[PDB]
Write a protein that binds this DNA or RNA. Structure first.
Lengths: 60, 165, 201, 170, 280
RNA sequence: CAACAUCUUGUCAAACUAUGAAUAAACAAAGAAGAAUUCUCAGUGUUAAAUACACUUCAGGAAUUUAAAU
RNA sequence: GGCGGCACAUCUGUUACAAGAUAACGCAGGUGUCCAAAGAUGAACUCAAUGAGGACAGAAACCUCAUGUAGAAUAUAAGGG
RNA sequence: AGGUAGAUUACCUGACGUUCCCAUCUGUGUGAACAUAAUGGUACUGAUCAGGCUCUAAGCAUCUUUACUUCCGUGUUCGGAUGGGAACGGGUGUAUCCUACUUGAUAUGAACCUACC
């Protein structure tokens, strides 16, 4: 009882019904695995800006 | 029926250009890549270490991270019915600067040059120049008149068949 | 036991030449491809005719051999040994496969084919056989060419070229150029007078 | 002020080679005869291809050595007096070198010993001109010009002058 | 006859020429691209090399960083300008190689202005021992790689006499002191060879043996009246006079045109003239 | 003679190829949120040192123009 | 169906259609290993072949010059380098 | 004009010859030490007696090659579409895209930083 093995027939029509789901913008903004020193520089500035902001919020 | 090897079907894809073997340029390793740039992945079979997968050959991507010896590249891959984001790290021997925005960067400079003169013209009170017109598909040609003194006529008719033997 | 000619007539499949992968190919039946006075200079035989195939099909090496013999005997009969030079312009570079069926210990459709023979995949308008002669033997040359076509399949066409004996130049172009020295005989063909390279002394 | 001084032909290298198939004892003696003949230790050559006809790849077969300068000249004089300055015209290469081979060696026949044996050497002479270094230097290696390169007749004239030895055309 | 020349058009249609400078035998592109590769995360920050080349008569030394347009030379010091500092003869010695390297180190720091805080070693007593320029206050020294080219780096090579000079000049060139004139013996061997001691023993040796050999090898020294003992003191003053004025120095050239090309008219006219004279 | 060179000649390749389409593949044609400029400008680090350069919501802040870019 | 074979885990070229995917008990072959060096690095050198020479030595032994885009070698199948 | 470093990697290569060297470069002299190998041939070091002989660089040739241009030729092939013709085999018309080999004409390098002339 041999059977047909494989076909691509009707596979592109199926794929375009709910068509190619593009990724959102947040998919291109990931920073996991970036440069180690660049990450250190960015974190150092963010901690500096945040501390200044919270100090000012404490004064008022 | 092929085998599922990593570098299957690359007798012609991974061959070097005719009379283009040996070492590459020096511009390839001296070109400076910055984040946000557009690059093209081009596997160099001459360098087998870190060779990118053959499915990314010819794809255009964007630089997302610069590491001491490798340049991060982010391309788009197509899956069953969706698209995923692929993040690779490729040495400059396998990538190449992309010219995809070369024409766009020309219009940006032309507009910026015009806008730079407008702040001068508005400062001095003169009317300001307009920005360059937008690109349009080849438009229908207008009415034209052809002078009758520098015109020659060539008669066109079906050609009598002649045997090629 | 040779299969009917209708089994291997249509041009089917990729070309299958004899190479390091295809072994055990029977030798082609045809071995001579130039007949007549093959060494006659270019100016001896001005007349030229062709056999032009009008079908896309296989021509087996048996048909080429059966036709070369037919023209050779006929042209020796009518013109003589030195009166003609007929060249066959198709070679059997294709190998046909046969899957032979012999009890109940037979895999029925589970097998490939063995090398069977040779043929040339011709196309429409291709020149199959050509030949050259003088004016005094053209009628005997055309007659022997018609008889050869009975050894082939499909439909053939006899064409009389307006050129010289296997040269691309027409009858009057050859006369003018040769008298100008642009044409240099080489025993059986010519060579154009080159106007390039180092100057002589 | 003529530049003829920059085209003076001179000996630049002389090679003596003894190729005997056997390895051991005789080769050790065949190496010692070159040490006495020239003055410097030779280099033992290995078999490039194994051939059963010659009973020969890892094994030492030959032992060649090259001498240059004044030492090369005097050994050439000894190897040419055996031939009595008689070199055939067909002994000269197309590139300006010549060579020959001998069976007996004068060596030291006073205390000649059969244990050492009898060996035959071959003499090959490589001539040159001042300026031939451009093909041998490490940096900016180039090719010598055709007119600067020697030829068979160039070597013949040198031989018939510096040694007066006539050349046979037989 | 039998030729079988492998130079036909079939050979050339597939021939692939090497890089032009490698075709000249002047550049090792396999090692050049190792010294040329700046880290990608250092955008356009120059990487400096000491290009040391020694000809038959002069010791060239330059400081170059590479760019796509070509190589740019930050500074360069030659040995043919050593006569301005009191060294007339022997411009390619181990001593003159040291002076050339020292001059470049002082000349460069003057250009960048950092010569006050980086002085290196100066006394002749400490010529033989290794010295690596170090951090001053919190300012790092000028770092520069050594480029040797197709020169074999033996255990006494001159290209390490230039390198030793720069380090004593205050420029940091990474190195190991196992290829200097020492690496065997001690600082006295390096120091003596730096002062021309190896040179200033041959004439004392040669004079004892022969007078013609002495005259043939050191002919210009005899005319200039430079004794084998004055060599040591000459190089001491050259180092002293270098550290106080390394700032380089300031007509129209006389060209010599050579052949010039032939235009299409002259090129075509000759062929017709050659064809005419053959119209034998 | 052959043989080997060399200049022509006729016919070829799914597991030969210099060259190489048509159809195709993946980008760009203005989203840290619709541009641009000017002034001001900090934290880390690169750096010989930086006023260079990199990242930091084109760090951040304020003015002027501005809805244009098949 | 059985007997035969493994298309059952797996690699190369081709079928295969110049993106990716991609059939048959399609075609031509391959794997269950081998390596303290055949891993890492530094230096030097240039391979196969051909022409011309050199005692034995010959078409095949070893030496020298010249030409030599890899026509050699790189553990293995094939394809890449 | 020359030399060092290069980027483009034959318009830069290969063969036949030709032109200067005034500086520079090269070739050239020697082997004491560092260092070098069987060989001061290489590489290393010391030098300046001579030379444009080679290199290098510049130019020549109905030169091979290579790089642009036309032509080959809208010819090969190709996407879309018949109740189009043919027994097959294969080959139209329509609205479109359009190579290659070859041949002929031209060229035989452009350009960057430093020093010296």
């Amino acid at each position: 009882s041999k059977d047909k093995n494989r076909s691509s027939h009707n596979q592109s029509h199926k794929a375009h019904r709910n068509g190619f789901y593009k990724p959102k913008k947040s998919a291109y903004m990931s920073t996991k695995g970036m440069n180690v020193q660049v990450l250190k520089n960015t974190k150092a500035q963010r901690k500096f800006a945040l501390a200044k902001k919270l100090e000012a919020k404490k004064a008022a | 029926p092929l085998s599922n090897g990593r570098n299957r079907r690359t007798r012609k894809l991974f061959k070097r250009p005719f009379r283009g073997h040996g070492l590459s340029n020096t511009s390839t390793i001296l070109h400076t890549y910055k984040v946000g740039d557009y690059v093209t992945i081009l596997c160099n079979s001459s360098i087998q270490h870190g060779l990118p997968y053959k499915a990314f050959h010819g794809k255009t991507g964007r630089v997302w991270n610069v590491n001491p010896h490798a340049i991060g590249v982010m391309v788009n891959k197509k899956v069953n019915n969706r698209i995923v984001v692929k993040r690779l790290h490729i040495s400059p021997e396998h990538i190449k600067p992309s010219g995809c925005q070369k024409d766009f960067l020309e219009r940006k400079a032309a507009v910026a040059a015009i806008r730079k003169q407008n702040i001068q013209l508005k400062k001095e009170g003169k009317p300001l120049l307009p920005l360059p017109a937008k690109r349009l598909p080849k438009q229908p040609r207008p009415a034209e008149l052809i002078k009758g003194a520098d015109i020659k006529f060539t008669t066109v008719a079906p050609l009598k068949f002649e045997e090629l033997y | 036991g040779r299969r009917p000619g209708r089994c291997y007539r249509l041009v089917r499949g990729h070309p299958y030449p004899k190479s390091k992968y295809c072994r055990g190919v029977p030798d082609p039946r045809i071995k001579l491809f130039d007949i007549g006075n093959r060494s006659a200079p270019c100016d001896d035989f001005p007349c030229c005719v062709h056999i032009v195939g009008l079908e896309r099909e296989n021509i087996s090496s048996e048909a080429m051999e059966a036709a070369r013999i037919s023209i050779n005997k006929n042209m020796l009969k009518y013109a003589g040994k030195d009166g003609f030079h007929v060249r066959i312009r198709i070679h059997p570079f294709h190998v046909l496969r046969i899957n032979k069926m012999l009890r109940l210990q037979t895999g029925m459709r589970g097998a490939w084919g063995k090398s069977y023979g040779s043929c040339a995949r011709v196309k429409v308008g291709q020149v199959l056989i050509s030949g050259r002669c003088k004016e005094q033997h053209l009628p005997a040359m055309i007659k022997s060419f018609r008889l050869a076509c009975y050894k082939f399949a499909g439909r053939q066409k006899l064409v009389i070229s307006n050129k010289w004996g296997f040269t691309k130049y027409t009858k009057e172009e050859y006369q003018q150029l040769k008298k100008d020295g642009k044409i240099i005989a080489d025993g059986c063909y010519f060579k154009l007078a080159t106007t390039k390279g180092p100057l002589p002394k | 002020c003529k530049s003829d001084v920059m085209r003076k032909i001179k000996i630049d290298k002389l090679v003596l080679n003894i190729s005997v198939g056997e390895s051991g004892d005789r080769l050790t003696r065949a190496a010692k005869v070159l040490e006495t003949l020239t003055g410097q230790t030779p280099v033992l050559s290995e078999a490039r291809y194994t051939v059963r006809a010659f009973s020969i790849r890892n094994d030492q077969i030959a032992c060649h050595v090259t001498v240059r300068g004044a030492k090369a000249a005097e050994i050439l004089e000894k190897g040419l007096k055996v031939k009595e300055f008689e070199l055939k015209a067909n002994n000269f290469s197309a590139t300006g070198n010549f060579g020959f081979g001998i069976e007996e060696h004068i060596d030291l026949g006073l205390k000649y010993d059969p244990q050492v044996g009898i060996y035959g050497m071959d003499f090959f002479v490589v001539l040159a001109r001042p300026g031939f270094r451009v093909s041998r230097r490490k940096r900016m290696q180039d090719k010598i010009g055709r007119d600067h390169l020697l030829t068979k007749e160039d070597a013949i004239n040198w031989f018939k002058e510096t040694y007066e030895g006539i050349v046979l055309n037989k | 006859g039998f030729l079988k020349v492998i130079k036909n058009r079939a050979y050339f249609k597939k021939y692939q020429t090497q890089f032009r400078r490698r075709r000249e035998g002047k550049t090792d592109y396999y090692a050049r691209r190792k010294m040329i590769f700046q880290d990608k995360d250092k955008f356009k920050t120059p990487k400096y090399r000491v290009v040391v080349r020694i000809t038959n008569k002069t010791v060239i030394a330059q400081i170059a960083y590479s760019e796509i347009i070509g190589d740019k030379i930050l500074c360069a010091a030659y040995s043919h300008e050593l006569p301005r500092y009191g060294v007339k003869l022997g411009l390619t010695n181990y001593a003159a190689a040291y002076c050339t390297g020292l001059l470049l180190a002082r000349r460069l720091l003057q250009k960048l202005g950092m010569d006050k805080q980086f002085v290196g070693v100066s006394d002749a007593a400490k010529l033989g021992e290794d010295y690596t320029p170090e951090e001053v206050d919190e300012r790092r020294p000028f770092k520069c790689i050594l480029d040797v080219g197709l020169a074999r780096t033996t255990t006494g090579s001159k290209v390490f006499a230039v390198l030793k000079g720069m380090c004593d000049g205050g420029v940091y060139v990474p190195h190991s002191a196992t290829r200097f004139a020492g690496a065997g013996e001690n600082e006295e061997a390096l120091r003596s060879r730096i002062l021309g001691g190896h040179v200033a023993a041959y004439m004392k040796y040669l004079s004892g043996e022969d007078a013609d050999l002495y005259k043939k090898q050191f002919g210009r020294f005899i005319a200039a009246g430079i004794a084998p003992e004055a060599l040591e003191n000459i190089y001491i003053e050259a180092h002293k006079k270098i550290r106080e004025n390394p700032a380089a120095e300031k007509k129209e050239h006389k060209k010599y045109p050579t052949s010039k090309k032939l235009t299409l008219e002259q090129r075509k006219a000759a062929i017709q003239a050659k064809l005419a004279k053959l119209a034998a």
